[model samples]
Target: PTTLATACKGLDGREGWSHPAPPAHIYGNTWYVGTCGIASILVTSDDGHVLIDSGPADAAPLVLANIRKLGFDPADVRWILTSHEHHDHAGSIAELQKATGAQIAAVASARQVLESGKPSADDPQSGLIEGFPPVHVARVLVDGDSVTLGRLALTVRETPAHSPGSASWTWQACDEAFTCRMIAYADSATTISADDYRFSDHPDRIARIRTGLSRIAQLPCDILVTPHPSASNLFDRLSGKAPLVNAQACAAYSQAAGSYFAKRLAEEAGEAA
Candidate 1:
């Protein structure tokens, strides 16, 4: 309750990705209610609440429990957002929406994937990324779309390629003294693919990744968080193991991903040749 270190002592979502981790406050009204390995954040306001991805399919109860632990009524949740339609992030969305009666929102390209609960043929990881429950998306979002709930407003930035409709969400969260800072819950920068998928074969997908990286780097980010906490050294920052605020965090993350992409492409070229 006081700090996550006490609640999660020695655990870092490594053992079992979906194992329970006590909910802890991030900054302002934002709270971390995710599993040990995954992330599920709650942005609260008196008017209503907005929930980010709800862990895996089996993590619905944990998400709901963590919400209740924070003295929030899940029934009042208004909008549920996603990072990508993957089994780890968007998997438990259907159960969450059902429990909270919240509307699901995502990018236009994700409508079919989220509603049908299957990866499209174009997705590089189609054969490898497991499908999840089909949950209807109520609102279609674009790159610049913003969802507001009372004093809370989170803007969307399309960071596709990890998935067709992958995105990052940004908002302002204030401290106890009401000093606000920009928080960017950046999308995963992973460029992993199915066994036979090759980056050399899809220039369009490569272009999307490049665009997505630019978008991520350009974000007005002060505190950077990712769908996978480890991706951003989240716990380290929280525990003072790492600097909590870094303006270059997003830029660095995207840059690192960019480098990895280049390596992946070159390896693909070498294999084909």
Candidate 2:
């Protein structure tokens, strides 16, 4: 297997998110099986597979088709993981869980959203964000907890503020030759809230974003993929047109988000912070 290469070339995701894109192999046993705009990865092993993020609700059938295109049976998926509780990310999870009959897992905050099918008052985007079909989370993970299936283990990093239970995931992806690298699927750092909400008014929320940024920058990351693939230009990186293994990618991403959040706060207050 070639490093940072996929069988399908020029997988375009520049347009619609729900549009179908050919499934392709990512590093090691991991595969990109989501739509052009979303990131739904399948980390396959002999036992079963771990599916991360189900994309928006409309993308469920496409996601399932993509999984089939990659020769993976959806029924063999043992676990379903998520990036955050937002609809665009978690919208299809309930559908996916039913399709695979797999155990769904998340942190308490995300679990609340998944179980309730609605954002809570604790979420910054409570009323503004659209809710999806609620699904039960069979396992609840705390910060530093790892979700294991067969030989694969993905660690959960609590990175709040993007959502109440926003989390960044990390795991060692290895090729058959034994060469391995850490893939860090970092959560979205976009500091967006409802129209009436302002970061300047919520010090705790700001602090949560700050801590999440710090945690992401320090993760053992070789390949950094974000909640929204476009946020990190993940498809370009996957196709090898861009640097695929930047050791500082996560750091750079976090720094940019920090500045973005700062600007938003300043704009909210109509003055420099």
Candidate 3:
């Protein structure tokens, strides 16, 4: 009744798509996991490290073990940033911060939602969880906000249609061996309605998301990271395979965002309603 593949499935599988663990790779001055929505580490240097998103709280120990297995001290991790407040994404922030003594940073709006037990956008179970640890938003970031880790610079672009507070970390850096590269955390969730846009409340956010997409599209990127793991071959790069760049990855996101806005406009026109 047991098989090695079955055991590995639960460990390595990404969502429904099964793939090997992405190979440890370097881009510019930092190291990162290419797959989005997964627990990825960003190593700035020997003494500085930043975690992208905290995986499931229950999976914190395993993630830490894996980080150490990859040769990190785990205790050196300095900053923990959540892409959004979805339970699966930010679930382990408190535990991991407690363990590593790292500060957690997210959008200011998300901080309120994270603190309030009410679901703000992407997370439906926000209020359902009782007695979760108190999360402090180390620093509230806005669109186009940039943070640096040594020589690497991460630009925050608010790409919220998926969640009210959804944002992307655009990584940029230059070293002699590594050329300038940029990658964005893609979100598939789009706005519900022009009226429901109240939850989004920020019109400039969509404009910025679209603008950022256009800007990133023209970058000399070798790979584009996304939360939608099944959509591309970059996951292979993350799991120790060759690097991959599919222009369509960003194109597809542009299309999705475009369609979402188009649908919203059509609905507002009273033509499709």
Candidate 4:
């Protein structure tokens, strides 16, 4: 019985969830340049770099500063990729694109929402979560699409559970010893929607979401990062506290998401009854 207002209350401003997190080099050339809660990751190369998720619109300045703090010019960003079209993730894309002149890329289904500056028609939180200024998407990606720059390349996987256009990225990065491992930036799989949105009401959408969760389990994930820093235990690993590497992280993440989804469905069923 989570109301739309309740679900969206924390996402509106920069007070609670927008505190700056120190930028850190997360395995190889991948970097964490987002807030304590929200995540904006950077994948670097000798030529240029690729940035994922731009945080909320008001958080743009913070994101840029973090990028610079890591000794990389924001103008050197060659591509801006997104996990989904939600404001928290894609809000600053337009501003960042203006500063970097980076080509925006996203799953094909998300292109319309990106261009129109609106929520997806199928989004359960469509009206609850406000949209940001739209940015032009230069490339429309499909499953198995590989985006490469210099010596870096990331494979895109369509995982549309959280949002209809939600996508994840995977790539290989090596340590100083040249020992390589697979790194994954998994998109959100939480089933967050308005009170009126019911998963049981749309069987096909539920099927798609479940399929997306399964796909995440199948990915070769040695290191897991997510759009929300906490979801993938990003901060813990960064602090050298525990679990710096877990080969089964993705499967565990997917299992937790699936359990949450089932719980939500049961809640909806109880409400209906």
Candidate 5:
């Protein structure tokens, strides 16, 4: 019996905030938050469902419990996406697949990391399930990959600042879509070192991610979903509650990303660049 405070921890970083409830803003989505990580599900109009990130091995049962609380059949989930290979992001993938017959999808580079049990900066070894079995990947998502549900289409954007294979999902519309940003990050600025975080050693990853963020900012959206709600919710969800538009919010996020990498690039250029 987790308390509400334990279920949905506010941005204050207090203890509890476990066993998350469905977000007030997202009508068709539900979330399960616990020590393992958060899991999000989208129930569609066509009677199908899609899930993003399947919590940790120990937390799978709890995720199922949360799904049931929301009146959804956990068994009906059609797809499970790996935000990145971080254990916390994909820890229970194998278990969830076995339990519900959902297809697991990940990027090629991240697939390797998932199989090797290595930790990128955003996904520390401690956050993953050590010695976990390899989960089957049904699809290899690329930069512009996407999945559609009802009128909403979630476009996958590979933004690797936090890890070698990080991504963000952009939605077209849903509820107050005219008011907020639809971009969601697999990892945030605090999750990784600024230096190691590059779009892909090629330098285009950042440009691409920025472009994607810019594109989403131009859409009609108000709901921005992420694995961890704390950081995203900070701008507009706090008690003071000052919300920025889609473009401004993403610009702020991009600035944070830039500041982190800039600090690292400075360190590498010479102790004092």
Candidate 6:
């Protein structure tokens, strides 16, 4: 069984997790421009683009280069959305916001941490990782709130498990032939905690997270993109190494996360005994 503390060990300073990956198209207008480990997706339209997640602070340059490689201008990015307030996911948002002058948006609860440059007090990993530079939020989203530009619209869902303000976005993307599919960019549900944090001590939080995972399983997800590439089998799908289209990917992801959460709780109980 993998405890949350053991699973998160050495994550803060892992260099391999920040290595850059080539930009590639996922389905239609959605593009994967993130690194091999962390994920950053670009949702484009005729009006502009909405970028989700910005990798780490040091990986900001790679993200910019990848955007340019895909024939898109960083200056044309109209909005920046985050999956959560974790350093590896939203760390470079401040820099990207400065470079592109894009409006930053997030779930309402995430605004405090995003604007204050502080970790959420409720996050188990808050004591382990350093906070990234704060970025201002131009728009705060509630569940079912939609952000539209041109013909593309992304609907927000509050899925707070990995962090207190974690969220997921769903939208439709059409190919050149006009075949449309529902696309979901899901937030990470891995239960990572600091050594001092105990899931047994927070029953309410654990219950809430379980509910969130259940909601993720029930979402209308056809094309799945996750905060971490491997979590959704993204590279395997892109490389033609596995099935590209999976209607069950999101449900499977939630199942795995739920198992890990259970394993973590059991492990903690053993340690206490």
lDDT of 4 by residue, 1-273 (tens): 322123323443455356666777788888988876688989888899999999988788888998998899998889999988888888889998898889988888789999988998788787888989998889888888988888779899988778888898999988889988899999999989987777888887798798789888888899999998778867667766567689999999999999998999888889965
Candidate 6, poorest ten consecutive residues by summed lDDT: 1-10
Q: Per-residue alpha-carbon lDDT of model 2 for 89-190, expressed as tens digits?
A: 888898888988999989876777889888877777879888899998999999899999988899989988476788999999887899888999898888
List CA RMSD, all candidates.
Answer: 1.7, 3.0, 5.7, 5.8, 5.4, 5.7
How close is every model to the real structure, measured as TM-score? 0.95, 0.92, 0.70, 0.92, 0.70, 0.91
**Sort order, lDDT high to low:** 1, 4, 6, 2, 3, 5
Task: Pick out the ten consecutive residues of candidate 5 with the lowest summed lDDT.
Answer: 11-20
Pairs that clash in candidate 1: 13-36, 13-37
Residue 244, candidate 2: alpha-carbon lDDT = 74
Clashes of each: 2, 0, 7, 0, 12, 0
Name the better of 2 and 6 by lDDT. Answer: 6
Model 5 gets an lDDT of 0.53
Model 1 per-residue lDDT tens digits across residues 1-273 = 255544455566556468887787788988888877788989999999999998888899998999998899999899999988887888889998999999998888677888998987778998887899999888999889999888889999889857777889999989989888888999999898999998788888888888899999989899999888888988767767688789899999999988888899889878865
Which candidate leads in lDDT?
1
Which candidate tops TM-score? 1
User: Per-residue lDDT for 224 in model 1?
Assistant: 94
Which of 1 and 6 is ahead in TM-score?
A: 1
Q: How does candidate 1 fare on TM-score?
A: 0.95
lDDT of 6: 0.83
Off by over 4 Å in 3: 1-23, 26-39, 121-134, 173-176, 188-222, 231-233, 237-243, 246-248, 260-273
Model 2 ranges with Cα > 4 A deviation:
1-15, 271-273
Candidates ranked, most accurate by TM-score first: 1, 4, 2, 6, 5, 3
Per-residue C-alpha lDDT of model 6 across residues 34-133, encoded as one tens digit per residue: 8767888898877999999999877788888889988999988899999989888898899988998899988887899999878888888877878899
